[PDB]
Specification:
This protein is of the alpha+beta class. The chain folds into 4 domains: 1-146, Rossmann fold (3-Layer(aba) Sandwich), CATH 3.40.50.20; 147-188, Alpha-Beta Complex (PreATP-grasp fold); 189-251, ATP-grasp fold, A domain (Dna Ligase, domain 1, 2-Layer Sandwich), CATH 3.30.1490; 252-494, 2-Layer Sandwich (D-amino Acid Aminotransferase, Chain A, domain 1). It contains 18 helices and 17 strands. The strands form 4 sheets. Strands 3-2-1-4-5 form a 5-stranded parallel sheet, sandwiched between helices. The protein has a 5-stranded antiparallel sheet with strand order 11-14-17-16-15. It is globular and about 70 Å long. It starts with 8 loop residues before the first helix and ends in a 12-residue tail after the last helix.
């Protein structure tokens, strides 16, 4: 019997064709991200080094989380206390993170999602001091810019987009990542109520007035007529002053689909199927599905392809999501590309057999896609082979294993509680304290759903869940959801 394990991270990098040894990682975050990151990487560590702590971890702990005794602290190998209060004083403080990363020192940082995870200055400052980042590089995020730039880049690449103030704007497109000229970028914004109403009548009401610098429930507004347009436009300005503003046609109740992207530092990028997150309650992804079956496999594959083209073009690295808008008929529209890993990523892990944070870490050490066991197995190749893999036209096109249903849940010392179920054995969850997620697997969608329902029911027993998880059951059992109808209007009269 051959030995597949290696001595140290050093031998691994060498034998797997990487070009950088990371063995000390700093987690710029807390909660379920801090924990999930560590659980996944340590799982991979024990499989590759027979040592769960082969890759060390340092976490930041604010006075709050420290007193509340978050599970992630005792889980970490080392922890550094940071100022409490709003995240700009700690988790979201780029200058602090880069500072701690250097002093220890660590060979890399992981931010996951939330806080400073989407701030290009973080990977920039980290790179400037020789500290790797488990995510896309600053050049790649910059090259993508906000929704304005990215949409121009989307249209440059011929991917559909919803009617917007920038419709039709494209950039002239061997190396070198795409860029959007400051003069082409301005042609997509509106400097006043004048050109605002201009674009408004060209896009048609209802529409959305959004600040690029917007987000977090700010800088956005729904205008349904030209009469209210002015006040609503000025309201967006007063909220996020200085911010470039653009208009976009309001999506007429359709399905929201995401494609899971994964790319190394060699121009190679693959799709790991997608997720279906149409069911939402007040801008909240309530129920999610893996993979997305509502849309024809043929149409979804194309969406994967456009997502990979978009990724390769901005020189993306690591993991990221491309959100699309699939309509009842058969049309889809690019919405955005999340330059980070998401909270509901386990869905993909479960149907593709890919340990994503482990993937990120290996990619950050410079290991190429075809040298990641998980990806090789997904492609029907040898676990530890070395032969190249033709991703464009594979000899064994990957197939997702089963189906996954995920539900966001709410309550009635510790910041993250691990949920287990004696009822269903194919379901696991957690609860941050507020909210949490439950991930149910099944041989097919049908079984995936049944499991979730039993698990949720097993949840209703707990006092903190004798109510909050009742509508999720009712929802999951409604014939409409069962048959997986295209229309999602039934949620309202539930």
């Amino acid at each position: 019997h051959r030995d597949f394990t290696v001595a140290s991270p050093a031998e691994f990098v060498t034998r797997f064709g990487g070009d950088r040894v990371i063995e000390k990682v700093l987690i710029a975050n807390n909660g379920i991200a801090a924990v999930k990151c560590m659980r996944s990487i340590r799982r991979w560590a024990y499989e590759m080094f027979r040592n769960e702590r082969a890759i060390r971890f340092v976490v930041m702990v604010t006075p709050e989380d420290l007193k509340a005794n978050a599970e992630y602290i005792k889980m970490a190998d080392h922890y550094v206390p940071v100022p409490g209060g709003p995240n700009n004083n700690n988790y979201a403080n780029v200058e602090l993170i880069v500072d701690i990363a250097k002093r220890i020192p660590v060979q890399a940082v992981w931010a996951g999602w939330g806080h400073a995870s989407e701030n290009p200055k973080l990977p920039e400052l980290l790179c400037k001091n020789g500290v790797a980042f488990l995510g896309p590089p600053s050049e790649a995020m910059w090259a993508l810019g906000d929704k304005i730039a990215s949409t121009v880049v989307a249209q440059t690449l011929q991917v559909p987009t919803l009617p917007w103030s920038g419709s039709g704007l494209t950039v002239e497109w061997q190396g070198k990542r795409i860029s959007v000229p400051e003069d082409v970028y301005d042609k997509g914004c509106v400097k006043d109520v004048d050109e605002g109403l201009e674009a408004a009548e060209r896009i048609g009401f209802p529409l959305m007035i959004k600040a690029s610098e917007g987000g977090g429930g700010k800088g956005i507004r729904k205008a349904e007529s030209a009469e209210d347009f002015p006040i609503l436009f000025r309201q967006v300005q007063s909220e996020i002053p200085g911010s470039p503003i653009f208009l976009m046609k309001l999506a007429q109740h359709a399905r929201h689909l995401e494609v899971q992207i994964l790319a190394d530092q060699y121009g190679n990028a693959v799709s790991l199927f997608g997720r279906d997150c149409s069911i939402q309650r007040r801008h909240q992804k309530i129920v999610e599905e893996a993979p997305a079956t509502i849309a024809p496999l043929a149409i979804f594959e194309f969406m994967e392809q456009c997502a990979i083209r978009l990724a390769k073009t901005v020189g993306y690295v690591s993991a990221g999501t491309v959100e699309y808008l699939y309509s009842q008929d058969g049309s889809f529209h690019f919405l955005e590309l999340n330059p980070r890993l998401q909270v509901e990523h386990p869905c993909t892990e479960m149907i593709a057999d890919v340990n994503l944070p482990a993937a990120q870490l290996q990619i950050a050490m410079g290991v190429p896609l075809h040298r990641l066991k998980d990806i090789r197995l997904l492609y029907g190749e040898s676990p530890w082979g070395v032969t190249p893999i033709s991703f464009e036209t594979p000899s064994n096109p990957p197939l997702a294993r089963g189906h996954v249903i995920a539900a966001r849940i709410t309550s009635e010392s510790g910041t993250v509680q691990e949920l287990n179920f004696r009822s269903s054995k194919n379901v696991w969850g957690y609860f941050s304290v507020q909210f949490g997620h439950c991930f149910s697997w099944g041989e097919n969608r049908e079984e995936a759903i049944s499991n979730m329902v039993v698990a949720l029911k097993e949840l209703s027993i707990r006092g903190d869940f004798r109510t909050t998880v009742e509508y999720l059951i009712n929802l999951l059992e409604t014939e409409s959801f069962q048959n997986n109808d295209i229309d999602t209007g039934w949620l309202d009269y539930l």
